[model samples]
Target: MISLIAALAVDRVIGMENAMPWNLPADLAWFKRNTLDKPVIMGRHTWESIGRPLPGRKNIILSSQPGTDDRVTWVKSVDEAIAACGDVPEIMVIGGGRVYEQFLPKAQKLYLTHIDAEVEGDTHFPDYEPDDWESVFSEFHDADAQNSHSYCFEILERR
Candidate 1:
């Protein structure tokens, strides 16, 4: 089960150079909901950007850096990552832009939180044509004074 997930701005920006531009707790929770029990693959920079293995899932770091972490299984290529993703009962492609792009075609499900504003960014989600996928579920959340940003949780299934 290859499910790719992200929370990005209206401009499709996912990162500000190496890290995400904002902190949206709701969107983070939405991500955890989809990926918590799965194996996840990410790039070297993605691993660096995130700081550590995400707490609940098995980590597959796609890095060429020297050492290893007891917390993660590191692989050097997309081919190896795909093999890792399949061996798990459920798996997710979490990212820096390239990791998401590489897995997008093989991914059947996308759990996206569409943040309603644009930000200054250097990394963006790859272009995706809506026609190729159908939105099977959506839950919208209005921004409150406390929440900071308006966003919608959407699940798109490839058609």
Candidate 2:
């Protein structure tokens, strides 16, 4: 299965200057729990924002620039990234704007965290019709000491 996962602001902002605009430890933990053992495909900026490969997941980066890092797999195109995933049961498309745009349509599922606040952002999640998806699961979390904003984690299956 192909899945796209992200945390978005009220205005659909996913990134600000190549990094997250909010601090949410709970959300990060939620991300880790779901994507931990999955093969995650991402763009170079997303990889750079993370600074290193996720320990338990196969990191596949889509970039034109060549890399020599053994910790992550580098591919020049989206097709190459998808191909590298091989027989993985689920392919996670983690992002940095452009990468999300490419995979959003092809994705069978979406794991979205909707933040309650609007923030400064240079990159936005691609537009999609909410009616086209059926929410399979959802949970709302109030802002607490560990997280700056209230958010809802929702899993939607393509309808």
Candidate 3:
């Protein structure tokens, strides 16, 4: 199964200047725990942001450009990434905006962190009709007294 894992704001903003606008350690831990030892596909910029391949996972970086770090298996298209993942029971599409757009259509599941606040950002998630995906699970996390940023984990399945 193909799944997308991302965090988005109310305005659908994903990132600013090729990096995530917010930091949530709990979310990062959750991501690592869930996707570890699985194959992960991402766009070049996302791979660059990490600076190295994630340990315990196969890294497939999608880029039209040539030349990248040896840790990544650079491919020119989404189809190539999918092919590289090759029969893995579950593949995670980790991303920058372009890569998310490319894989969204083919994704059967989405693990989204829906932050309660909105912020100005350079990149945005692709817009899709509500009817196209069904919310299979949801859990809201309350913010602590100091941090006012509440968020929710939503698991969606394509209809």
- Tell me the TM-score of each prediction against the true structure: 0.92, 0.96, 0.93
Writing each residue's lDDT as its tens digit, candidate 2 over 1-159 gives 899999999789998888897899888988999899899998989998999889899999998989768789999988899999999889999997899999988899999999987888899989988889999999999999889899999999999
Query: Which residue pairs collide in model 2, if any?
Result: none
Model-by-model lDDT, in order? 0.83, 0.91, 0.85
In model 1, the number of clashes is 0
Q: Which regions of candidate 1 fall more than 4 Å away from where they truly are?
A: none
Evaluate model 1: give its TM-score: 0.92
Candidate 2 residue-wise lDDT at 55 = 89
TM-score for candidate 3: 0.93
Worst 10 residues of 1 by lDDT: 63-72
What does candidate 1's lDDT look like per residue over 1-159, in tens digits? 687898889789988878777667888778887888788888888888988778888888997665367678888788887786566766788887888888888888888989987799888888987898999999999998656888899999989
